[PDB]
């Protein structure tokens, strides 16, 4: 199905204590394949997925150089934005950046995106057409004007429509043995008495990939989305994910409830009754 390649960048200033902590990470769908950490010992772009090792020495020289260049830009922007928002040089401020591209089942370009944040709030982003910019406030505007005169959009577009995709296809090919796999969830349900007349039913979805999934409870076939507890999908740490949804039903009325599990690793959804 659809696939994407995404890079995540985080810079946090430490005025007076050290260089801003810079952390970049790369993903292909839900699999992280590379990482960099200005606090680490290698000071090189490092591998985080077996198949990335299929790359050659010039790959690591190149990605290390490019990633350091990113750190250098983020370092200047921390300063630049500080001035813009007229803030003290004492406090710690954060800059976040994300960008990447999506491809269909034929592995052809669907969409590209490049977003920038300052302290956890939109600052500026490349719109859908990949030719215009969305500025958050007055500050962003000044950057926007600067990025238009500089044709950053054109550069980002060339990368997002070409290079990004080209490489995504490439990693997809080398990672086929895994990236293109789909681990359907191993599901099960738990019935534990809660009150003297009520019972809690928890729907479990484990060991699945990608992380995308939907767990909805129904009563007599009607969605029950206002008496339930849903947990945020979470990483198992072994590549797969986990998630559970529970509802509080009158004891004796359990047979009326069913949990539906949607996951692309499944031919058709699953229905579960206690």
């Amino acid at each position: 199905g659809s696939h994407s390649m995404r890079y995540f960048f985080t810079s946090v200033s430490r005025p007076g204590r050290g260089e801003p902590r810079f952390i970049a990470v790369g993903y292909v769908d839900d699999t992280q394949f590379v990482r960099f950490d200005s606090d680490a010992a290698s000071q090189r772009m490092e591998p985080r997925a077996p198949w990335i090792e299929q790359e050659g020495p010039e790959y690591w020289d190149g990605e290390t150089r490019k990633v350091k260049a990113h750190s250098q830009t983020h370092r200047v922007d921390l300063g630049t934005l500080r001035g813009y928002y007229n803030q003290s040089e004492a406090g710690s401020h954060t800059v976040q950046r994300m960008y990447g591209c999506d491809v269909g089942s034929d592995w052809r370009f669907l969409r590209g995106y490049h977003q920038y944040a300052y302290d956890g709030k939109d600052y500026i982003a490349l719109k859908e057409d990949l030719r215009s910019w969305t500025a958050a406030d007055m500050a962003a505007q000044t950057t926007k004007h600067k990025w238009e005169a500089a044709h950053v959009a054109e550069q980002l577009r060339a990368y997002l429509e070409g290079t990004c995709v080209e490489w995504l296809r490439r990693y997809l090919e080398n990672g086929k043995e895994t990236l293109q796999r789909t681990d359907a969830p191993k599901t099960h349900m738990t019935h534990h008495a809660v009150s003297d007349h009520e019972a809690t039913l928890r729907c479990w979805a484990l060991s699945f990939y990608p992380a995308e999934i939907t767990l909805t409870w129904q009563r007599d076939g009607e969605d029950q989305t206002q008496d339930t507890e849903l947990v945020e999908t979470r990483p198992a740490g072994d590549g797969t994910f986990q998630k559970w949804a529970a509802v509080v039903v009158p004891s004796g009325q359990e047979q009326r409830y069913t949990c539906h599990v949607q996951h692309e690793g499944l031919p058709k959804p699953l229905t579960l009754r206690w």
Binding site: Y7, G26, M45, Y59, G62, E63, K66, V67, A69, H70, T73, H74, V76, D77, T80, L81, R97, Y99, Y116, I124, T143, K146, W147, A150, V152, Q155, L156, Y159, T163, C164, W167
Partner: peptide, 9 residues
């Protein structure tokens, strides 16, 4: 593969 460079804001 990363962008060859990101322009300063």
């Amino acid at each position: 593969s990363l962008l060859m460079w990101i322009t300063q804001a």
